[PDB]
Amino acid sequence: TEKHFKYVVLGGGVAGGYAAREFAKQGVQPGELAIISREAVAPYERPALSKAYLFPQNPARLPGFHVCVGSGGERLLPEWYSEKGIELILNTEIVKADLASKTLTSAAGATFTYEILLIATGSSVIKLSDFGTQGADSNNILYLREVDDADKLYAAIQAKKGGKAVVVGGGYIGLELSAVLKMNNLDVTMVFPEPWCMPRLFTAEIAAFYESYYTNKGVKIVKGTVAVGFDADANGDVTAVKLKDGSVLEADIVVVGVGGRPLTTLFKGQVAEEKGGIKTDASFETSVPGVYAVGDVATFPMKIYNDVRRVEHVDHSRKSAEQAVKAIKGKESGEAVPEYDYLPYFYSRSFDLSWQFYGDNVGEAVLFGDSDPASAKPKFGSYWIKDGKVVGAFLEGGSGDENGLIAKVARAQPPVSSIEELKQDGLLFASKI
Numbered sequence: 028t029e030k031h032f033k034y035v036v037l038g039g040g041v042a043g044g045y046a047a048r049e050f051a052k053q054g055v056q057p058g059e060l061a062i063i064s065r066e067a068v069a070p071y072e073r074p075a076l077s078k079a080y081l082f083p084q085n086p087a088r089l090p091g092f093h094v095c096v097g098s099g100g101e102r103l104l105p106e107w108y109s110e111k112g113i114e115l116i117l118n119t120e121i122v123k124a125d126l127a128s129k130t131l132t133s134a135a136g137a138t139f140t141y142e143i144l145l146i147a148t149g150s151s152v153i154k155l156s157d158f159g160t161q162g163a164d165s166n167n168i169l170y171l172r173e174v175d176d177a178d179k180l181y182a183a184i185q186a187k188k189g190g191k192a193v194v195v196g197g198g199y200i201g202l203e204l205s206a207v208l209k210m211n212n213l214d215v216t217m218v219f220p221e222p223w224c225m226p227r228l229f230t231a232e233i234a235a236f237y238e239s240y241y242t243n244k245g246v247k248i249v250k251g252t253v254a255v256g257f258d259a260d261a262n263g264d265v266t267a268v269k270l271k272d273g274s275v276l277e278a279d280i281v282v283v284g285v286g287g288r289p290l291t292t293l294f295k296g297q298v299a300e301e302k303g304g305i306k307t308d309a310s311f312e313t314s315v316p317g318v319y320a321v322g323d324v325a326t327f328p329m330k331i332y333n334d335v336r337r338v339e340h341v342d343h344s345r346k347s348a349e350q351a352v353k354a355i356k357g358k359e360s361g362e363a364v365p366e367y368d369y370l371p372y373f374y375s376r377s378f379d380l381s382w383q384f385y386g387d388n389v390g391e392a393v394l395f396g397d398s399d400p401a402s403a404k405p406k407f408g409s410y411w412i413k414d415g416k417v418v419g420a421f422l423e424g425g426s427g428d429e430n431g432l433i434a435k436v437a438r439a440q441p442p443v444s445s446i447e448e449l450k451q452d453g454l455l456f457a458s459k460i
């Protein structure tokens with residue numbers, strides 16, 4: 028009929044799951060907390076979907092990558108929630124939220140009320156149909172966001188093995204999926220309009236490592252164009268991808284990753300919005316008191332650069348959720364909570380490659396170490412320098428110890444005397460803060 032909970036988390040993804048963990052840690056009592064989710068499963072570590080979920084043998088499958096294993100904490104199975112009297116309400120989609128009345132409505136008519144609301148609704152894919160691309164509705168043109176998408180992609184990879192796959196996009200989705208499709212032995216061509224891959228993060232030299240490495244694996248890369256059409260066949264299945272530059276690629280499966288948008292749609296006009304997200308303070312509270320927003324949807328004060336930003340980082344989803352739960356319990360008990368202080372951190376893994384990045388990629392980049400893609404065990408990095416201070420750091424193929432160092436460089440923002448003593452001595456510069 029109508030259920031009330033003191034705390035309601037809306038969205039059962041990374042941040043919802045991590046928030047539930049912090050609620051338990053902070054001494055949440057049975058009956059107080061609900062987590063409302065549109066998916067059929069308990070919170071899971073979404074980055075595995077474009078990685079081990081799609082491996083040729085013994086792909087990762089739930090319940091193995093439920094949160095919080097992805098950061099090495101305990102696995103929250105559905106029975107973890109119910110053991111704590113945390114109500115995990117699955118297969119439920121909120122289609123209406125009314126903040127004044129503190130009321131949420133499901134597609135099927137159930138209503139939920141709350142005292143405190145944690146919005147963790149994440150992001151949705153941008154699709155090529157969004158802007159009328161010809162034949163974009165053809166079957167086997169596929170997007171990847173949730174585990175249900177992952178199963179369909181996996182089923183289509185099985186059907187089309189030994190086929191041709193086109194990947195549209197050069198973001199981390201494009202790169203990761205291009206790799207997995209080549210590991211499943213399809214003939215892969217990657218296509219994107221930007222001039223090199225990962226264009227919001229990589230510099231031209233970084234990108235040239237990855238693009239050469241991919242081409243050596245057999246993944247072709249076409250840059251500076253876009254798909255403007257798709258040919259199909261009688262059952263309605265994609266057969267071809269028509270490029271803007273007149274060219275045409277054979278295709279049995281197309282995987283698209285041209286970015287996303289935060290699902291703020293329920294709250295439009297009800298909270299302040301900024302840079303596409305829901306504006307939060309340093310404790311993740313919105314314009315409306317007792318309503319918080321975390322993970323992809325939140326636009327928050329980035330204290331280290333004295334800026335306001337919105338990010339799409341698994342690590343931020345985890346930390347922002349913890350911060351909001353600590354702020355809510357802080358408000359109840361009077362006790363002071365320190366301002367969110369996030370250091371941006373992104374990572375990816377494709378083929379047998381693995382890189383990290385920390386900080387801000389502004390200013391002049393300088394490479395160090397070894398960029399030859401023909402090394403069996405490639406290792407190299409890059410620092411970004413602004414105002415005689417290193418403000419960002421990247422590393423491909425670091426041990427785990429070294430990743431620790433660059434993170435420290437990124438935080439401390441150490442001066443640069445000599446560029447030369449920095450390029451011979453890339454990882455060795457780090458030690459001298």
Ligand SMILES: Cc1cc2nc3c(=O)[nH]c(=O)nc-3n(C[C@H](O)[C@H](O)[C@H](O)COP(=O)(O)OP(=O)(O)OC[C@H]3O[C@@H](n4cnc5c(N)ncnc54)[C@H](O)[C@@H]3O)c2cc1C
Pocket residue numbers: 037038039040041042043063064065066073074075076077119120121122147148149150171172173290293321322323324338339340341342344372373374375376
């Ligand atoms: C395939 C893939 C790979 C990724 N890889 C990486 C990576 O390698 N590194 C990295 O740092 N980041 C990665 N990201 C981003 C990361 O996965 C995080 O999940 C994301 O940044 C945000 O987590 P979140 O809790 O805000 O949103 P999500 O985890 O998307 O969760 C939002 C939840 O809310 C539910 N929901 C939304 N609207 C409603 C509604 N109206 N009613 C009910 N439920 C609703 C959604 O279905 C979902 O379950 C990746 C993302 C994807 C999709």
